[PDB]
Design a protein around this nucleic acid. Structure first.
Ligand SMILES: [Mg+2]
Ligand SMILES: [Mg+2]
Lengths: 336, 333
DNA sequence: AGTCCACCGGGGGACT
DNA sequence: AGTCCCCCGGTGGACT
């Protein structure tokens, strides 16, 4: 659970355990002795807590101590089971830690859009925990899907064909000169629910916790929307980075521009909203870095920033609160 | 020495040791038990050798193995003086080795600029070791300088005043927002007239002695303020190994440079390139075929010119020469 | 001392 | 099984 419980651990099928001994099952070319079963840890640690949507105690806990819980728990399991034999490298901890921050944050945002899509339809503003109800004119036409995007995704895949053609048009004209414009992906993407999903349930149900089934619901959500999004319906991109290093600022910042250049540039979409979330900015450097303007629109168009802001959630609750407010505000020029 | 010498390691003061004990001299908020004197690893391992400029054994040795040596040596030294206890975290190495690759590869391009400048200036074309003499018609005006840029650098600081200025008339009608500049791992700038007769730009160097480390790391200052827009000839970014996400800083910087120099100071396209010894997944190459974003509003070329993978210190050196040999043509004799 | 910078390799899971 | 994708935190040194 969210607090290590040797009883819950004792009822774990050996293959649901958080640590995995592999001193007999060596990995190809890898010295790894014990694996961090990140999926497992998630379901153990967050089986029924979805931070921001749980106990007040939890919701306002320092968000770092929350995101860092799953690791703590697993290290305890290891020690308990293996003791001294136990050893895992910093880089495992960083790998998993960084993933968990991305997954859990998205889970929060998932629930945020549940509640949001409920109300948005003909539901109310669910009671608990208490968050300020939005003000905006409700409308089914104003629900949104929250797509935690997967490794080596291509954001362009979300778009409707007519828009994918414009682009592969463009690129072909580039390709005719030894020139490419590869597109990658943000860590997550909030889209406007395509019409024909506006009546579907799933986009309205808050989840109790990140159990395996529940994890999967989220990590796959994107598959449903591929080919169904309109250029202007990409309405928020987020990049997740637990801690910062001056060199690790550049993926979101570059892609952002590429998205702007295509969406805004070649498909006349409104300014593209792309932000970055971190729990550790290590100076001011990071902040000034993301004050950078958007490079396409520096050669008749209005100037705006590539990244709209750099955000550092204190609590899972603030994250909720922050996103509700964005939705309330951004879902305005959306005639419902 | 490039080969781990016991005797030498013993003949070593302790302020010289490649491995530092600090178990009783900790770092605020750090579990670091043993530090890596990476300046004492250059020194020890490369104090006599500058790859591609030493014996043929080195010059053509697998270049990964060369960069990998200081750290090999270090870990031997550590295991002799601290048999039970010697331990360092993966990430300590990853830092040191990354930097060494930046420094030494800069230290190879330095001796290149050296011997090339000599040629240009009317001295010989030295030939220890032999490299094909360049067919460019020499000139003191086609000398180049190889700046190993420091952490925190801003490459604009290299530009001359009237140029930095215009990067303000534009930049100032542009602020809640802005457009910062960072730095390539290294720059190659045309030597500026005022310096074309100094002798420091022509002396090659024997090893990476602290004195010598320091001369190459200091070099940039000498050129702050004194460089034309089109005289920025080449930018390199050193990444010893690649990870798909670790690809974007040279890509962005390049765009920004290209943006200002090319579109705002009407300079020639800018040559920006990456050197790595380990691309692992070949995402990278396709990644570095990206059109320059600036240019997609005007009329076009790659942002990053190429992604390069040196086999040997020698390959590195021959490549840079041909670059010069084909690029300085533009400079007027 | 304390603060900032930019190095990169060991990773768990998707996918084949 | 093999390969690839994107995670980040622990660092050695320049400054102040
Ligand atoms: Mg991320
Ligand atoms: Mg580099």
């Amino acid at each position: 659970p969210f607090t290590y419980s040797i009883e819950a651990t004792r009822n774990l099928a050996t293959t649901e355990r958080c640590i995995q001994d592999i001193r007999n099952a060596p990995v190809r070319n890898r010295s790894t002795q014990f694996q961090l079963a990140q999926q497992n840890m998630l379901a153990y640690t967050f089986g029924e807590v979805i931070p921001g949507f749980a106990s007040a105690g939890i919701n306002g806990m320092d968000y770092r101590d929350v995101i860092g819980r799953p690791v703590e728990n697993a290290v305890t399991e290891g020690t308990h089971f293996f003791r001294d034999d136990f050893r895992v490298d910093s880089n495992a901890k960083a790998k998993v830690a960084g993933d968990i921050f991305e997954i859990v944050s998205s889970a929060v945002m998932w629930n945020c859009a549940a509640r949001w899509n409920s109300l948005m339809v003909g539901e109310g503003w669910r009671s608990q925990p208490r968050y300020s109800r939005p003000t905006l004119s409700p409308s089914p036409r104003r629900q949104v899907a929250v797509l935690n995007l997967p490794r080596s995704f291509d954001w362009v895949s979300l778009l409707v064909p007519e828009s994918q053609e414009v682009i592969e048009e463009f690129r072909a004209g580039l390709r005719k000169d030894g020139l490419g414009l590869p597109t990658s992906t943000p860590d997550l993407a909030v889209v406007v629910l395509p019409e024909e999903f506006q009546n579907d349930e799933m986009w309205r149900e808050e989840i109790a916790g990140l159990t395996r089934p529940n994890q999967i619901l989220l990590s796959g959500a994107y598959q449903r929307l591929q080919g169904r999004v309109q250029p202007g319906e990409i309405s928020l991109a987020v990049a997740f980075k637990r801690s910062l290093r001056s060199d690790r600022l550049y993926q979101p910042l570059y892609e952002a521009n590429v998205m702007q250049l295509l969406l805004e540039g070649k498909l006349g979409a409104p300014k593209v909203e792309f932000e970055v979330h971190t729990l550790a900015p290590e100076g001011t450097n990071a902040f000034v870095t993301y004050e950078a303007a958007s490079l396409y629109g520096l050669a008749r168009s209005a100037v705006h920033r590539a990244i709209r802001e750099l955000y550092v959630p204190p609590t899972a609750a603030d994250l909720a609160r922050r996103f509700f407010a964005f939705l309330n505000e951004r879902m305005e020029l959306v005639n419902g």
